[PDB]
Every structure is written in structure tokens, then in C-alpha cells.
């Protein structure tokens, strides 16, 4: 039926690193001067042991991609770069995507392209993924490296080797497997190294209790687009009180009509102007909720900004574009930590679930949501991060990009059907449901036009 065919999830399956290995040429180990010395040492020894020359490439925090490109042209014929920028990485107080390793991963990639190095980059992360619910995502921002890395792989295959997660603070798994991983036997580019073995990222189809809105339900990005559709769905399900939040609030385009629409569907509705990146403003808002309709659910549909500019991706612009999504999510997480929420739903995207050319500015913030929901569930808190495909009707510019997705086999979902998928995901307490209409015959050939993948090996329709 319609709903069941929309449903997927990310799993981690046992897989082979590749056989043996044996490397030639020089490998650079990119790192910050302060951090990751132990892992760099194990990495060097593991690469040397397979037969490679290994040299350190000390990167400055938030460096310029042009002085770095100059440096890379002098070192001469490099066979690969191993990045530890995200290993042993400090967590100083800042917004989650201010992360230097994100900014420097992008500059490193760009400097490798500018300098015509001709060699792949491999990025190591530490507990950034969970192969199962018994593992905790350590820093949800490190998933942004995976989100954008999958886009970079689709835009410039030659420069992206892949992504490798290891347990935080351990080197034995990296030492054991690194050589076979970068020798690239089995076409794996999204790997988790664990004490018990090697795991590859995989898409999988996902086959009494009934969630209902109660008290006050909060929708960010609630005055338009997908959030407005969510508002309508909640009203039909009888939400006692809807609280819609956006930057403009009751001055947003269509807001007055939306409120009248929701009132006629049954829901008493408050609209508030609120900048959800401002923790204190959000705190004031939540404190104005009455005792008889306490906050019972959050639906965080604040979208990523797009100014319509096509510069080179920078960590700085990504952090700004996605702050409502990212900082809003973390603010709401911190401020509802002690409420008895029935649902805390983060609106993520296919941009992080598998990525696409042009979506590099969107995947990092949605990847962060994916990790924040898993972290919350590890910590005993309710959370759902829905990776949406495209929606029909409300929102989304028509032109060459959205036509391109449909051409590539991602079909817009009727709002009614997507919300039914969300209902089922909530009733089953899924942490990271993927909800998307894919025509696999078309999609796979578009997705692998320039680069093979194993990400879809477990989907029957894919073979």
C-alpha cells in the first residue's frame, strides 16, 4: 500500500573491509597541531605497515583554502589523504555546526581539487554513528561530515575516498583495518569499525498504541511549507491547542488565512513570532503555555535558509543557513528536557539520508537532527528524526531542481500520505524513519551515474 512503500531506515550490516591491501606512494595524514597524536601514530604505523610513505599535514583551525592549496602543490604525487580533523576534537561552547572539522574538511577538499592532487580523501570520525541502539552518538554535529561527504562524493568522485567511524579514543580498530579500507577492495565508502568487526551503511525497507495530539503542540516553521501541512494534520487529529512559531509569526505570508484554516479544521491556534536560535526567546515562549494545555509534542519543521546564491560551500555559510534548524533543535531539546513530551519530531531530509548534487548546504543540518534524535533516545528521551522525501502541494520551488528530483525518481508525496507515514512511525516509536517515494528503476541509475555505491545493496527493488 501507499504508506508502506514510503518506509526505510538506515542499518549497519557486517561487511568485508577488502582483502589484504598493499599501498604505494605517499599518504598524507591531515590533523590539527594540538589534537589526535595517538590516532595519527596508529594511522601512520598502519599505513607504513602496508607499504606507504606517510607524512603529517598539519592544518590550521579554520584555515584559508588557498594557502592550503599552495602547500598541497609542493608535496608532489600524493596517493591519498587521511583526515583526523574530527578525531580527538574539542567541544567548546558554540552552535553545533560552528565545528572547525566541518569547515576544514570542506577547505581541505577544495584545496585538493585546486591543487589537482588526483587522490581520494578519507575522513575518520569518533563514535559519530551508532551501529545499533546499544551505541551512543557522541557528538551529533560530526554526522554533518557524513551528510556533506556523501554529496561531495556525488559531485566530485575522485576527491572523496570515504568515511570511517571508530570508537572514540581507541586506535585498535583503525590499526587493524585501515589499510584494507583505503585499498578499497569492496566498494565500501561508509564504514563503522567496531571491536567485533566492520560494518557498512545500508538502506533497508521498514515493515494497539496510537499517538494523539494533546495539550499544546508546537510547530516551528509552522506558518508555511511542510510545517503548515503538519499544522493542518494536527488540527484534523484534534490538537487541543496549536502553537505555530516562525521568525515573522503572525506577519508571515498567509498566516492569518492559515489560522482561519486551522480554526475551521477544529484547532484553536496561537501564532508567535520567535527566533528559535535565541534560547532565551524560546524559554519565554514555553513559559507562557498554560497549565491545562501543557506542551506535549514538538514538531520542529524550521527549514534551512537559502538566499539563492551559488558560492563554494563553506562551513561558515552552512552554519548560518542551518542555524534555525540546528540551534533551534538544540534549544528545544535543552528546554523540553524535563517535560513529559509524547513526541519530539525533527524534520530531516533525504539530503542527509543519501544526498544529491546541489544539496551540500542542506545535508549537514539534517544529519545533525538524525544524530540528536539518536542521542536523545540513548538518554531516555523521546525523539523522532524523519528524513523526508519531497512533498506535494505546500512549499518547494517549481523549477529545474525540483523537476530534476522527479526526473531522478523521487516523487512528491501527498501531504495526507506523508502524515500517515509519520503517524505509523510515531506509533512504532521509530527513531530515524525515512519516508520517501522512490522509483528505484530510475533513481539507481541517476545515483550511480558517476560513482558506484553499496548503500542500496539490501533493497530488492534496487537489484
Amino acid at each position, epitope marked *: 500500500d501507499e504508506v508502506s512503500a514510503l518506509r526505510y531506515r538506515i542499518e549497519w550490516r557486517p561487511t568485508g573491509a577488502g582483502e589484504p591491501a598493499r599501498l604505494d606512494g605517499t599518504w598524507l595524514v591531515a590533523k590539527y597541531a594540538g589534537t589526535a597524536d595517538e590516532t595519527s601514530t596508529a594511522a601512520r604505523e598502519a599505513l607504513e605497515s602496508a607499504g606507504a610513505r606517510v607524512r603529517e599535514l598539519v592544518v590550521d583551525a579554520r584555515c584559508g583554502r588557498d594557502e592550503l592549496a599552495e602547500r598541497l602543490r609542493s608535496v608532489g604525487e600524493v596517493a591519498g589523504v587521511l583526515s583526523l580533523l574530527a578525531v580527538d576534537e574539542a567541544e567548546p561552547e558554540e552552535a553545533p555546526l560552528a565545528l572547525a572539522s566541518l569547515a576544514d574538511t570542506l577547505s581541505l577538499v577544495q584545496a585538493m581539487v585546486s591543487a589537482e592532487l588526483g587522490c581520494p580523501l578519507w575522513t575518520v570520525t569518533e563514535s559519530a554513528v551508532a551501529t545499533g541502539p546499544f551505541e551512543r552518538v557522541r557528538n551529533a554535529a560530526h554526522g554533518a561530515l557524513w551528510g556533506v561527504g556523501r554529496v561531495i562524493a556525488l559531485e566530485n568522485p575522485a576527491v572523496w575516498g570515504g568515511l570511517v567511524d571508530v570508537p572514540a579514543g581507541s586506535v585498535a580498530e583503525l590499526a587493524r583495518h585501515l589499510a584494507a579500507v583505503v585499498s578499497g577492495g569492496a566498494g565500501e565508502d561508509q564504514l563503522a569499525l567496531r571491536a567485533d568487526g566492520v560494518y557498512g551503511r545500508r538502506w533497508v525497507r521498514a515493515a494497539d498504541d496510537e499517538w494523539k495530539p494533546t495539550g499544546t503542540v508546537l510547530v516551528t516553521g509552522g506558518t508555511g511549507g511542510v510545517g503548515g501541512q503538519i499544522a493542518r494534520w494536527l488540527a484534523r487529529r484534534g490538537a487541543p*491547542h496549536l502553537l505555530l512559531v516562525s521568525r515573522s509569526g503572525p506577519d508571515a505570508d498567509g498566516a492569518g488565512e492559515l489560522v482561519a484554516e486551522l480554526e475551521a479544521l477544529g484547532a484553536r491556534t*496561537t501564532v508567535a513570532a520567535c527566533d528559535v536560535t535565541d534560547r532565551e526567546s524560546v524559554r519565554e515562549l514555553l*513559559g*507562557g503555555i498554560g497549565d*491545562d494545555v*501543557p506542551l506535549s509534542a514538538v514538531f520542529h519543521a524550521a527549514a534551512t535558509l537559502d538566499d539563492g546564491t551559488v558560492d563554494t560551500l563553506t562551513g561558515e555559510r552552512i552554519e548560518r543557513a542551518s542555524r534555525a534548524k540546528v540551534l533551534g533543535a538544540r534549544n528545544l531539546h535543552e528546554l523540553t528536557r*524535563e517535560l513529559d513530551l509524547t513526541a519530539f519530531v525533527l524534520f530531516s531530509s533525504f539530503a542527509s539520508a543519501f544526498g544529491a548534487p546541489g544539496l551540500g548546504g542542506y545535508a549537514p543540518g539534517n544529519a545533525y537532527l538524525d544524530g540528536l534524535a539518536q542521542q536523545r533516545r540513548s538518554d531516555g528521551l523521546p525523539a523522532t528524526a524523519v528524513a523526508w522525501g519531497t512533498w506535494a502541494g505546500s512549499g518547494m520551488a517549481e523549477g529545474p531542481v525540483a523537476d530534476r528530483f522527479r526526473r531522478h525518481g523521487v516523487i512528491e508525496m501527498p501531504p495526507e500520505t506523508a502524515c500517515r507515514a509519520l503517524q505509523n512511525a510515531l506509533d512504532r516509536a521509530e527513531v530515524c524513519p525515512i519516508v520517501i517515494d522512490v522509483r528505484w528503476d530510475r533513481f539507481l541509475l541517476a545515483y550511480t551515474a558517476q560513482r558506484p555505491t553499496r548503500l542500496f545493496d539490501e533493497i530488492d527493488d534496487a537489484r
Partner: antibody
Framework: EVQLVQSGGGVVQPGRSLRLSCAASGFTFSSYAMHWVRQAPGKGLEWVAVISYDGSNKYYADSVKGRFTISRDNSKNTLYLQMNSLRAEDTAVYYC?????????????????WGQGTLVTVSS | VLTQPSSLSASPGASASLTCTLRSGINVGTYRIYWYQQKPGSPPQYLLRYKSDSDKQQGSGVPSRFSGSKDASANAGILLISGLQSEDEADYYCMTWHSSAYVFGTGTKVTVLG
């Protein structure tokens, strides 16, 4: 200044009815939920009922549910408590009390300002 | 539903901790506790409310030596009167929403010793 001027106390026979009123001034009456609270002499505070700023929501304590009706007249800046089937247990000072000003289209909060009270005595 | 000690005494200047304990089987964490002071022959006066460090508010005009918090161990809300003065002798009531009604605690009388 905020004022809640209460009327309508006195003696009432067991089983009969009594209507309390509270005339509000010094604030925009229709922007505030309104509570009734009672206190039997020498005893503790007992919440009775609340009505939302626009009158569309009402809640009552179990001990009065089905006997009392709370209501308001936003064109007369007046709050009412209609009390029926009164017993000796209902003898108390009855306080009008104002919630803080309404922020959202729905929701009530506990009082931030109280009236002086009126004694209702249920007696033969 | 809401249990308070009938009496509490402390000498001037001390820090009096008034407790408002919820029934077991119900977590104090999510409840917004309102506090009222009532002096002889006067209507109650609103002091403050506390749900958590995220969600709390001081009543208009109420001196800041009155503060709120919670003791999760004791499943109880706390009203703290720092710098207890003789003026603070009074009955103190906590109040919170539960089910479809507001409910008051049983009340605590505060005597200033000495």
C-alpha cells in the same frame, strides 16, 4: 489599581442556591482568566473553579462538579459563581481571583491577584 | 495530592525551606508549583511559581529572598525564604494543576522563633 469587588454572600438554607458576583476594575477584564477559591474558617485554601478569558473553557473541582456553574459577563466586567444544592461543607469565605493576562489563544494559569472574599454560611 | 508540613519555625535571618510533596506515583518534575502567602485577615498573596530552572517566575513586587526550586529525591517543591524576617510569619500554600483542576497543598504556618 486592580480591584475585585465582591457581592452576594450571607446565609443560605441547606439544599438551596446562591449566586456570588465579582465586579472587576482597573484592568481589561476580558483578557484574564478568573478563578474562584474558598476557605472554610480556620481551614485551608480549596480551589473551586476557573473560567478562561473568553469564557469558552471552564474547569471545576470534583467537590463542586455538577452543583456549581462559573460564568462571566465580559460586557459588564463581572464574574459569577452560581452555587446549588449547598450543604454545610460549603460554608466558607469565597474569593474571586484573577489569573495573569492571557498570552495564547488557549490556556489558563493560577491566580496572581485575589479579592477580599465573601462569607457564605449554609444554615437553617 | 499536595502535602505540606503544618508548621515550620526558624530564627530571624535563617533560610526556611517549605516543602510541597506530591503523591508517590506522580513525578514532581513536570508540575508548575505556585506559592501563596496568607496573613491574618488578608487575602492570599501570590509569591512565585516554579516548574524547573527553565520555567519559573517571581511574583510582581515579591522580594527575591523568596525563591523556588524542587527536590527530586523528596518528590517535592520547595519555597525558600532567605533572610527570614518577622514580617514573614503567615500561612503558606502551594498550588498546582493536576488532572482537570487546580489543587492546593494543606498549608504551612511559619513562626519566627525567638
Amino acid at each position: 489599581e486592580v480591584q475585585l469587588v465582591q457581592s452576594g454572600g450571607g446565609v443560605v438554607q441547606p439544599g438551596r442556591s446562591l449566586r456570588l458576583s465579582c465586579a472587576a476594575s482597573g484592568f481589561t477584564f476580558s483578557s484574564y482568566a478568573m478563578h474562584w477559591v474558598r476557605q472554610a474558617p480556620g481551614k485551608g485554601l480549596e480551589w473551586v473553579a476557573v473560567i478562561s478569558y473568553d469564557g469558552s473553557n471552564k474547569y471545576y473541582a470534583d467537590s463542586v462538579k455538577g452543583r456549581f456553574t462559573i460564568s462571566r459577563d465580559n460586557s459588564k466586567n463581572t464574574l459569577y459563581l452560581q452555587m446549588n444544592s449547598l450543604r454545610a461543607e460549603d460554608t466558607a469565605v469565597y474569593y474571586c481571583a484573577r489569573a495573569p493576562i492571557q498570552v495564547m489563544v488557549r490556556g489558563v494559569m493560577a491566580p496572581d491577584y485575589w479579592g477580599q472574599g465573601t462569607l457564605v454560611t449554609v444554615s437553617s | 495530592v499536595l502535602t505540606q508540613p503544618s508548621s515550620l519555625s526558624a530564627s530571624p535571618g535563617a533560610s526556611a525551606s517549605l516543602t510541597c510533596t506530591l503523591r508517590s506515583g506522580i513525578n514532581v518534575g513536570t508540575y508548575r508549583i505556585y506559592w501563596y502567602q496568607q496573613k491574618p485577615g488578608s487575602p492570599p498573596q501570590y509569591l512565585l511559581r516554579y516548574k524547573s530552572d527553565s520555567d519559573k517566575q517571581q511574583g510582581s513586587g515579591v522580594p527575591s529572598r523568596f525563591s523556588g526550586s524542587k527536590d527530586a529525591s523528596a518528590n517535592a517543591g520547595i519555597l525558600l525564604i532567605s533572610g527570614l524576617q518577622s514580617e514573614d510569619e503567615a500561612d503558606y500554600y502551594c498550588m498546582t494543576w493536576h488532572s482537570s483542576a487546580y489543587v492546593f497543598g494543606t498549608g504551612t504556618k511559619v513562626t519566627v522563633l525567638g
